């Protein structure tokens, strides 16, 4: 190393400095507060009955946590799609609003809910925008909703003079006019009612049985975010170099116990240098201290090039109980581990020197080490 | 690098590098000047002794 640094094949008797020393992080940890205030989709998914399509139940959800993990893993599902984004990454997608359109309809007309497709429900009851970014869930619901006695209490509009714009609910079902002949009063000639009542029993055709469908819609970054999935956090490690992240507190160091007092609202810690040094764990309520990773320079003590070839290595400003971590394979910055383990390690004020034994007679100084210590090559 | 692209953020990193390097050069310059002054004082003290 010193031959390469001095740019010569010979090095003169003395002290020299080489590249520095650093310690790499052992592992990684993350921490985030308790996951609470779940989004109340459980009641809607467990609701007794959903209204018709022309009476489409639109529900507002915001300011909560949506556990899409338990969404993906509900037993009675038959269909779960997201045509705008990937359904997998919803755990890390925070939108400012949630609109839930819930209904139960015939299983043969579900695909009309996808935008750009026609259909009675999608033309006279409820359509969706062409640029819709959202999700659709369809599952079997005839097991509890359909009965053999006759369940006609479901309705759907079949006739109208116009196609409603997206996000439009209508209650009026006035006597539909088709031709030029006037109509009013009660049922007569060319006076057909816009809607028709369903019939949902478990004895109709397979695929015609009622299905429960919920559609999720959301906005994208024009207002403060309200809802998204939980952020998982690992356990905590102490007294070892790690890569912490406490709510965006990216950094590196060693975490130790703290003996200072914070305030109920105070969260961080800083010093005159204006750098982070103390934190409060989110999930629990204690104070942790951050200490930067140990590091320092490296120096070589050598006699004349021709006189000998043995050397000694000095680590500047390192507590020498930590150099055992530097006594490792592929952990310390230097690669010459051969002198990582060597002769009797001696401790001084500037660090601990490897490759010499501290005799205690008296001589002059030949190679200045420092703090009252000088080294030489002798018998 | 999280926000900006991987080919043009080099402009910003170069700006920061140049600024920090210039600051370091300034620091070592005043260090040299103060060292020279202290050397003059030390020579005077040695003569006094």
């Amino acid at each position: 190393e010193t031959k390469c640094t001095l740019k010569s094949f010979t090095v003169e008797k003395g002290i020299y400095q080489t590249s520095n020393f650093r310690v790499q992080p052992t592992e990684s940890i993350v921490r985030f507060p308790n996951i609470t205030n779940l989004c109340p989709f459980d009641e809607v998914f467990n609701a007794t009955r959903f209204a018709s399509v022309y009476a489409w139940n639109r529900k507002r959800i915001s300011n909560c946590v949506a556990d899409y993990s338990v969404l993906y893993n509900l037993a009675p599902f038959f269909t779960f799609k997201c045509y705008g984004v990937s359904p997998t990454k919803l755990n890390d997608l925070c939108f400012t609003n949630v609109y839930a359109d819930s209904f139960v309809i015939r299983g043969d007309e579900v695909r009309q809910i996808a935008p750009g497709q026609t259909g009675n429900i999608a033309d006279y009851n409820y359509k969706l925008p062409d640029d819709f970014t959202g999700c659709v869930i369809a599952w079997n619901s005839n097991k509890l909703d359909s009965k053999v006695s006759g369940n006609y209490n479901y309705l759907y509009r079949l006739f109208r003079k116009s196609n409603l714009k997206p996000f439009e609910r209508d209650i009026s079902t006035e006597i539909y006019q088709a031709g030029n002949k006037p109509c009013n009063g009660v049922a007569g000639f060319n006076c057909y009612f816009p809607l028709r009542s369903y019939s949902f029993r478990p004895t109709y055709g397979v695929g015609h049985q009622p299905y429960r469908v919920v559609v999720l819609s959301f906005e994208l970054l024009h207002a403060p975010a309200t809802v998204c999935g939980p952020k998982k956090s690992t356990n905590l490690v102490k007294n070892k170099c790690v890569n912490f992240n406490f709510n965006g507190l990216k950094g590196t160091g060693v975490l130790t116990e703290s003996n200072k007092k914070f305030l109920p609202f105070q969260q961080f810690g800083r010093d005159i240098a204006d750098t982070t040094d103390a934190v409060r764990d989110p999930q629990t309520l204690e104070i942790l201290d951050i200490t930067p990773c140990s590091f320092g320079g490296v120096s070589v003590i050598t006699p004349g090039t021709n006189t000998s070839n043995q050397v000694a290595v000095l680590y500047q400003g390192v507590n020498c109980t930590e150099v055992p971590v530097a006594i490792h394979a592929d952990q310390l910055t230097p690669t010459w581990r051969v002198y990582s383990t060597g002769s009797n390690v001696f401790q001084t004020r500037a660090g601990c020197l490897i490759g010499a034994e501290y005799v205690n007679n008296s001589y002059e100084c030949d190679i200045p080490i420092g703090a009252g210590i000088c080294a030489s090559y002798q018998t | 690098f999280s926000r900006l692209d991987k080919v043009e953020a080099e402009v910003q990193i170069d700006r920061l590098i140049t600024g920090r390097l210039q600051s370091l050069q300034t620091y070592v310059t005043q260090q040299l000047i103060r060292a020279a002054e202290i050397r003059a004082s030390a020579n005077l003290a040695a003569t006094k002794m």
Binding site: N20, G297, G372 | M49
Partner: protein, 127 residues
């Protein structure tokens, strides 16, 4: 430090910094010159003598009272009284809180040996 200060613990910045050249090399060279000159300063000032003298236990200097300047063994250090006042009157974590790769090497000579030189000078000039 060359790279720790500028953009420490970075990979691509470390790659893009090494193509400027030998800047931090001459930085380190200048700082090393500064440090060795700093040690040489005290070496020049205090090492004018060779033998380390020592004052006799008897302290009757013809009526002159030197007890203020001579060392007193009561304190663990071999320091006089005026020296004690001087060391108390001067005050600077500051030696440690600087942690961006800015090391502070210790002086080659410690305070005890400097005090021993001073004691030798006093003994020689009074005896």
């Amino acid at each position: 430090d060359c790279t720790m200060y500028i953009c420490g613990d970075s990979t691509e910045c470390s790659n893009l910094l090494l193509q400027y050249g030998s800047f931090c090399t001459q930085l380190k060279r200048a700082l090393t010159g500064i440090a060795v000159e700093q040690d040489k300063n005290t070496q020049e000032v205090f090492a004018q003598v060779k033998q380390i003298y020592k004052t006799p236990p008897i302290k009757y200097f013809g009526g002159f009272n030197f007890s203020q300047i001579l060392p007193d063994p009561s304190k663990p250090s071999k320091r006089s009284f005026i020296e004690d006042l001087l060391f108390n009157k001067v005050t600077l974590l500051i030696c440690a809180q600087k942690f961006k790769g800015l090391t502070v090497l210790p002086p080659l000579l410690t305070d005890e040996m400097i005090a021993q030189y001073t004691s030798a000078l006093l003994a020689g000039t009074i005896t």
